[PDB]
């Protein structure tokens, strides 16, 4: 389990404790607890249980911790420090900072920050099993814990920071002592089950919710339990199982320690070895199937618990001196023995079989022990046979004479069970000795076991000596200092593990340390084993604690309690702990230099000569784009490398003094080290399997430290580490060993070939594709989507967009011309030209944390009209095209340039441009542009952010639509910008205008029909400043022309506001101090006019400027220092806020630096001419009891009910889904959207289930020859994709879709429409 206990302040130079009351602190008095009570909350915030009030600050007072008044403390080595190099103390019982002391635990010896901060999940509600947020405000009192009232189901707490004006709760789970509420005492067979549906949880997320309430994640090991897992009413269709493989190299493994026997791999996916691939597993309980899905994915789950658990073991690591017939190996009792002749499987059985013997089984780690230390070192270069056999369906392997399977050793990362198969056969491979899969047909050496007899001075065991077959091991009785006869030095997993059943064997409490000899002489950070005397045995091996380096200098110990075998680390000047020691030692063991320091890198790859490796780094420019942690590795992989990993402690400053000299900006970058597996326990580990010796992390006391598992170095331009999670996008830089070739699986490098060959053959053969640029066609090469993306995109080359009907029809034809019908090929289809660097996918009203998936679409020759809208498992090998960038930036032209330069009053100068106002009379774009000309310039042409950020700043005086001035032939690309400009980029919002492609009417002679465009000013909406395109032959307001000029190239007052731009050099903290000195505050923008206008006024300074916007949270929550929601928000990136301040970029967007840095310049606001923050939602509004694990979410006196749910009826759906909206409540019909404010409530609601849903079902029908719905109403409001539909019959689907459209689906068969009924949601309001 886990949680967070209520502790109490102990102070250590003066050896008492604290106590706060209304005014300060005052003498202690403690010892009688019953009116104090301290534990940590979010934002790194101290709560008292009994004033219900936060510390904070130079008086040190408890204020209610609603506020910004640097309330937050830090982890330092002993003590506490707050905002900037402060401190905590007391003097004569009253505490005050000092700003230069030891403060513990009450009953402990911890700096009350060694325990990590161990966050609660929530079941279901209108949060979707986010993690609770403490405290939180209801009725004037703050609570810290899950409240139990008599309205709600159970334990409920809020889930994000401001819970009054979000609304948003969630019942919580905490760990119960049986599984009789919340829980199904009884299962299939043998547990107990916890089906939360509605959840969008990532797999690390979902396993530590099932972690922390004891239980763990599912576990599927007969067919029973899956047949069981089918037929179960309240389950969802798509969820999680722990099956993954998180590790450096292993197979794959069940989230619980339960062996992985019956498989149930989905036979449709190809299992991308590298690249695609992924690393945990999702079960689908439709067809009950086994998949490999990227579990950085938000997808339900479910917990289970044992019933009745009980703590039952074996003799597994004993001793037998005993002897075989003649040449079988003995060990432990048994006798193991490969045949060095080569067989198949079965003739090989039936033929050690005759013999009093049978292939071999492996139970537990002393098979594998056996298998890895003897057999000729591990089978260097062997394949061997092993007695596991597969015969039924769904798959259960079991072993040739046995009971029961109780350890699988996989190997990383192939069960690889195959679709058409039925013996399924395994097979040795590897340095650690794992199980690969076979066919039983080739002919490979196999190895078989007996079962034997049972049966010298040099190890007497009479005096306490246990022996474990080649090397003894002694304890001692006492020992205080560190080494004061024997130091023990250990060498793999399997020597650890026998230590640990040694070690629980002599002992029978806990709280009794056993010393190892492993410390730092030179105390230079990196451990190494204690030298006997010319002995310098290298570390092989390592499993620390949870966090265990946190000191330069110690000595190191084995817990025993339940931290069994973790090497803590301890004081080496006084601390008592027990010793054990070995006869015996390897002379062979560190006797082995591979790597030379004289071999250079093969080719590009860079290093200095104190390095033994070479390094590839990628730049943020120079990749097509930003990845993953996972993906990261996987693309280090691919090339044969893996990520960074250093031995020693020097080796990574000089790595870092290295990779500075490459960068002139600071950037991180990925690095191997991870602690994801749930194997590791929260120890870190190496990608490359290499033990981590050195201390490299610091003890953040972040909230969510169990889900980051990630290490991420930062450069400076002059070893800083921090923990990010695996879903951030990042940078990286391969290595690879000195001696070790590397890869080029069709690539970057080996594109070579690929330059000349194909691009000429491309560029001979195939002519220009009408209305676009040249289209490689890589055929007869099928790659996966990411791997597609990365042999298309290069230096100018790419992945080929469509966003014309004509180049549609002309790639279609092509394609039916090369390859056929049947085949399919990756395009990204669109409207218009998308830019890779900016994504536009950030959701304007709020910013909710859900991570939206990979968009990567597929077409084929034929049905290309249908599924060019539709997502495929892109997890598949398929031809591609690639398209060609043109020259961009080297077009010149405007010869004039001292003539047409003329700058008068009317006219105000932007970057090398000028703009002239007119009247906002209408006129249409026809009309507007001899308008424009009878002055001297052209229509406003927008190329960049900041000139549409002008614009946006002109826009307030003018009208409420101004001509923008750029017309494209109907169904086709847009050029010439009506100035001879290449189209750069477009500004057009996919939740106002439909961003998929439009498809015409296919009988149109000559009905070619000009669109123009034109930008809104929405009046107060957040959307003002886009772009919206129309048939410009109708009129709209003009007061906007452009001109060209080449020789000409304090307290500011906008819209009620007052600006002081401070040029100073200087960080956050001294930034707001400096406003608030001049009677201001930083600046909070919300609204994306006062947005446009710094960023036009930051450009005007050249450099980006603070803004009063800074997080608490470590970096999961931002707001404003004024204490105004979050609501209007400019990131540069989705997922790029890594540092804790923001400031405001030149280009408009908002970076995110950390505040302890200079920047040369800060805004400071103030708002006299309007002062008004009177905002407070009212919900009133109780939902009814919750159905089959679906809550109803109230929202504006309704009660929406999204079935995320097994169903599979689709014969006639019209009156299918009202029965089954009515019978699961009365008083509830399908959903209808009547309003504006709905549909954006129903695609919020849709877009936290983005990964297994794309439509939500609507009730839409064609009675009385209309469109309406189902009820006796007509239909009022619409939001469709491109005009009104023309559906004339009754047999259609209409589905909200991921973006606020509304599509509907025709069909003539119903077993056609089968994808639209798989991804969609049937939601049933109440009203
Ligand atoms: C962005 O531009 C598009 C134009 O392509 C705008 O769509 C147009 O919006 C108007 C306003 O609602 C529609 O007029 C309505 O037509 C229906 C047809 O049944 C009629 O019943 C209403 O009384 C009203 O006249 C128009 O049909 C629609 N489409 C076109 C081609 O003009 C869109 O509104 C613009 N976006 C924003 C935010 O204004
Ligand atoms: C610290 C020192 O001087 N010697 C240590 C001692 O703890 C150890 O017992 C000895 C070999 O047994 O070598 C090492
Ligand atoms: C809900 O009902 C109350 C009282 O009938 C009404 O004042 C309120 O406007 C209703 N909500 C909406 C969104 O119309």
């Given at each position: ?11 250590g ?64 080595h002993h ?23 030891v403060?513990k635990?009450?009953?402990?010896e911890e700096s009350?920050?060694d ?360 304890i001692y009785e006492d020992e205080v200092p560190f080494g004061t006869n024997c130091n023990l030095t250990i ?8 230590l640990?059943?040694?070690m ?7 709280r009794k340390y056993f010393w190892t000899g492993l410390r730092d002489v030179d105390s230079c950070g990196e451990y190494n084993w204690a030298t006997v005397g010319?002995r310098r045995r290298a570390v092989?091996?390592s499993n620390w604690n949870?966090l265990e380096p946190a000191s330069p200098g110690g000595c190191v110990a084995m817990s025993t309690?339940?931290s069994?075998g973790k090497w803590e680390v301890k004081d080496c000047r006084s601390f008592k702990a027990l010793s054990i020691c ?66 020693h402690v ?41 033990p981590v010796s050195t201390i490299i992390?610091?003890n ?628």
């Amino acid at each position: 389990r886990a949680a967070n206990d209520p502790f109490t302040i102990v102070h250590g130079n003066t050896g008492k404790c604290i106590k706060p009351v209304y005014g300060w602190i005052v003498a202690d008095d403690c010892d009688e607890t019953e009116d104090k009570l301290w534990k940590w909350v979010s934002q790194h915030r101290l709560f008292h249980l009994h004033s219900q009030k936060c510390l904070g600050l130079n008086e040190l007072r408890m204020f209610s911790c609603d506020s910004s008044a640097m309330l937050w403390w830090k982890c330092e080595h002993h003590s506490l420090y707050g905002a900037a190099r402060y401190r905590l103390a007391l003097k004569d019982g009253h505490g005050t900072a000092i700003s230069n002391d030891v403060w513990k635990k009450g009953g402990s010896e911890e700096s009350l920050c060694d325990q990590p901060y161990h966050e609660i999940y929530t079941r279901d509600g209108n949060s979707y099993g986010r993690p609770c947020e403490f405290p939180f405000l209801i009725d004037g009192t703050w609570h810290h814990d899950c409240i139990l009232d008599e309205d709600h189901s159970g334990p409920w707490c809020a889930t994000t920071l401001n819970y009054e004006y979000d609304r948003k709760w969630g019942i919580c789970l905490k760990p119960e002592n049986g599984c009789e509420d919340n829980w199904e005492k009884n299962e299939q067979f043998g547990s107990c089950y916890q089906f939360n549906t509605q959840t969008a949880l990532s797999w690390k997320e979902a396993y530590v919710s099932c972690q922390n309430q004891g239980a763990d994640l599912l576990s599927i090991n007969s067919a029973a339990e899956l047949t069981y897992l089918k037929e179960k009413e309240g389950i969802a269709k798509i969820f999680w199982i722990g099956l993954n493989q998180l590790y450096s190299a292993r197979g794959w493994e069940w989230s619980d320690h339960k062996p992985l026997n019956f498989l149930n791999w989905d036979p449709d996916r190809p299992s991308a070895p590298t690249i695609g691939g992924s690393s945990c597993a999702r079960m689908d309980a439709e067809s009950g199937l086994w998949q490999s899905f990227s579990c950085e994915a938000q997808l339900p789950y479910v917990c289970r618990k044992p019933l009745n658990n009980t703590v039952e073991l074996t003799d597994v690591w004993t001793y037998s001196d005993t002897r075989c017939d003649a040449g079988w190996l003995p060990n432990n009792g048994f006798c193991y023995l490969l045949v060095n002749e080569s067989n198949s499987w079965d003739k090989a059985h039936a033929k050690c079989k005759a013999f009093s013997s049978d292939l071999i089984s492996i139970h537990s780690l002393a098979d594998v022990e056996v298998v890895v230390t003897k057999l000729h070192n591990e089978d260097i270069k062997e394949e061997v046979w092993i007695g596991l056999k597969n015969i039924n369906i769904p798959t259960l392997f079991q072993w040739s004479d046995g009971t029961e399977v109780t350890l699988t050793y996989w190997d990383e990362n192939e069960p690889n069970v195959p679709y058409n198969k039925t013996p399924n056969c395994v097979s040795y491979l590897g340095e650690l000795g794992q199980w690969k899969v076979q066919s039983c047909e080739e002919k490979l050496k196999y190895v078989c076991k007996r079962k034997g007899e049972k049966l010298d001075k040099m190890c007497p065991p009479d005096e306490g000596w246990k022996r474990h077959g080649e090397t003894c091991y002694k304890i001692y009785e006492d020992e205080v200092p560190f080494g004061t006869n024997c130091n023990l030095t250990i060498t793999s997993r399997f020597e650890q593990e026998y230590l640990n059943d040694l070690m629980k064997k002599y002992d029978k409490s806990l709280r009794k340390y056993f010393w190892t000899g492993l410390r730092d002489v030179d105390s230079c950070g990196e451990y190494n084993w204690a030298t006997v005397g010319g002995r310098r045995r290298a570390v092989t091996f390592s499993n620390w604690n949870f966090l265990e380096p946190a000191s330069p200098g110690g000595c190191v110990a084995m817990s025993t309690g339940k931290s069994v075998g973790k090497w803590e680390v301890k004081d080496c000047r006084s601390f008592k702990a027990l010793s054990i020691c070995k006869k015996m030692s390897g002379p062979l063991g560190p006797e082995e230099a591979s790597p030379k320091p004289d071999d250079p890198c093969p080719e590009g790859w860079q290093s200095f000569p104190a390095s033994l490796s070479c390094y590839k780094v990628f730049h943020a420019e120079r990749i097509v784009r930003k990845r993953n942690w996972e993906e990261a590795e996987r693309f280090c992989q691919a090339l044969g490398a893996h990520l960074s990993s250093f031995s020693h402690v020097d080796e990574i400053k000089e790595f870092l003094h290295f990779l500075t000299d490459q960068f002139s900006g600071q950037h991180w970058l990925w690095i191997g080290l991870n602690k994801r597996s749930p194997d590791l326990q929260g120890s870190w580990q190496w990608s490359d399997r290499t033990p981590v010796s050195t201390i490299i992390m610091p003890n953040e006391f972040q909230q969510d430290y169990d889900i980051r598992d990630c290490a991420a170095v930062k450069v400076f331009h002059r070893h800083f580490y921090d923990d990010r999670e695996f879903i951030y996008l990042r940078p990286f830089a391969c290595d690879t060993k000195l001696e070790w070739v590397c890869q080029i699986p069709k690539g970057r490098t080996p594109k070579t070939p690929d330059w000349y060959n194909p691009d000429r053959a491309g560029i001979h053969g195939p002519p220009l594709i009408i209305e676009g640029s040249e289209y490689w066609f890589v055929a007869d090469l099928h790659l996966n989507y990411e791997e597609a993306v990365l042999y298309c995109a290069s230096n100018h080359s790419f992945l080929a967009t469509i966003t014309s009907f004509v180049g549609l029809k002309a790639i279609k034809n092509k394609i039916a011309n090369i390859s056929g019908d049947g085949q399919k090929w990756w395009i990204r289809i669109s409207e218009w030209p998308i830019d890779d660097h900016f994504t536009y996918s950030r959701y304007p009203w709020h910013r909710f944390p859900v991570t939206f998936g990979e968009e990567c679409l597929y077409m084929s020759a034929k049905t290309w009209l249908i599924d060019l809208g539709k997502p495929t498992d892109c997890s598949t090998k398929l031809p591609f095209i690639c398209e060609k960038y043109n020259v961009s930036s080297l077009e010149k032209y405007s010869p004039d340039s001292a003539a047409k330069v003329q700058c008068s009053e009317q006219w105000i100068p932007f970057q090398n441009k000028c703009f002239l106002k007119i009247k906002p009379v209408s006129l249409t774009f026809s009309q507007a542009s001899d308008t424009c000309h009878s002055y001297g310039g052209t229509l406003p042409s927008v190329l960049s952010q900041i000139e549409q950020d002008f614009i946006t700043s002109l826009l307030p005086d003018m009208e409420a639509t101004l001509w923008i001035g750029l017309r494209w032939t109907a169904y086709e690309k847009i050029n010439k910008w009506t100035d001879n400009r290449e189209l750069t980029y477009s500004n057009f919002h996919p939740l106002l205008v439909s961003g998929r492609l439009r498809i015409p009417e296919n009988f149109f002679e000559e009905e070619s029909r000009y669109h123009c465009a034109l930008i809104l000013n929405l009046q107060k909406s957040p959307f003002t400043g886009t772009w919206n395109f129309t048939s410009c032959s109708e009129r709209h307001f003009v007061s906007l022309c452009q001109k060209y000029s080449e020789v000409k190239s304090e307290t500011v007052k906008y819209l009620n506001n007052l600006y002081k731009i401070i040029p100073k050099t200087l960080t956050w903290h001294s930034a707001k101090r400096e406003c608030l000195k001049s009677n201001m505050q930083l600046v909070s923008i919300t609204d994306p006019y006062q947005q446009a206008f710094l960023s036009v006024q930051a450009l005007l300074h050249n450099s980006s400027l603070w803004i009063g916007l800074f997080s608490q949270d470590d970096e999961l929550n931002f707001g404003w220092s004024d204490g105004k929601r979050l609501h209007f928000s400019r990131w540069a990136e989705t997922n790029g806020q890594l540092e804790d301040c923001v400031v405001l970029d030149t280009d408009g967007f908002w970076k995110t630096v950390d505040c302890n840095d200079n920047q040369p310049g800060a805004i400071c606001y103030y708002s006299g001419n309007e002062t008004e923050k009177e905002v407070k939602p009212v919900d009133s509004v109780k939902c009814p009891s919750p159905v089959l694990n679906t809550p109803w979410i109230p929202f504006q006196n309704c009660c929406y009910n999204f079935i995320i749910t097994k169903n599979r009826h689709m014969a006639t759906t019209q009156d299918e889904v009202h029965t089954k909206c009515q019978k699961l409540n009365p008083k509830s019909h399908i959903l209808s959207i009547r309003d504006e404010k709905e549909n954006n409530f129903v695609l919020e609601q849709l877009l936290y289930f983005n990964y297994m849903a794309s439509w939500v079902m609507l009730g839409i029908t064609y009675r009385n020859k209309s469109l309406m719905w189902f009820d006796k109403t007509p239909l009022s409001y619409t939001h469709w994709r491109a005009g009104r539909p023309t559906i004339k019959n009754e047999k259609f689907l209409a589905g909200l879709s991921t973006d606020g459209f509304w599509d509907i689906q025709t069909f003539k068969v119903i077993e056609e429409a089968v994808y639209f009924h798989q991804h969609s949601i049937l939601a049933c309001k109440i009203e």
